[model samples]
Target: PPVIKIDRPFHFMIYEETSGMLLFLGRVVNPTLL
Candidate 1:
């Protein structure tokens, strides 16, 4: 596996539906993750 070095919109959005996870995804985790 690479990192953000390799990933598409599919895997990103697939990770979350932009729910409360947005908080964590926006702050905690890198916005790149979702």
Candidate 2:
């Protein structure tokens, strides 16, 4: 067994299911206070 970590940058998105319409997208490197 090993410990898993998510210490990396990645992309994410949100979309409508019916028509496959992309609503929003973003990336995170080092997220801070919003």
Candidate 3:
């Protein structure tokens, strides 16, 4: 997997027949590289 750093908030949305208009909202805080 490729590692990435996040310095801001992000929104991830998903749509499917199982869950209509379902969205997964989250953010990566204090992201760092090793």
Candidate 4:
């Protein structure tokens, strides 16, 4: 597992590089865990 810190709005996508199959897509306005 990995930990990341995000402080602002962002968009991201996760996919298989070989197959072009999207695994996940998301937008994050906040990432604080509390």
lDDT of 2: 0.83
- Top candidate on TM-score is 4
The Cα local distance difference test for each model comes to: 0.37, 0.83, 0.58, 0.84
Model 2, 1-34: lDDT tens per residue?
8986767887788999999999999888877744
Is candidate 2 or 3 superior in lDDT?
A: 2
- Model 2 misplacement above 4 A: 1-5
Models sorted by TM-score, best on top? 4, 2, 3, 1
Clashing pairs in 2: none
Q: Which candidate would rank higher by TM-score, 1 or 3? A: 3
Q: Tell me model 4's lDDT, rounded to 2 decimals.
A: 0.84
RMSD of each: 9.1, 3.0, 6.7, 5.5
lDDT, candidate 1, 1-34, per-residue tens: 8655533232222234555353232232445554
TM-score preference between candidates 2 and 3, better one: 2
Q: After superposition, how far is residue 29 of candidate 1 from its true place, in Å?
A: 3.0
Q: What would the per-residue lDDT of candidate 4 be over residues 1-34, giving only the tens digit for each residue? A: 8978566788999999999999999887767752
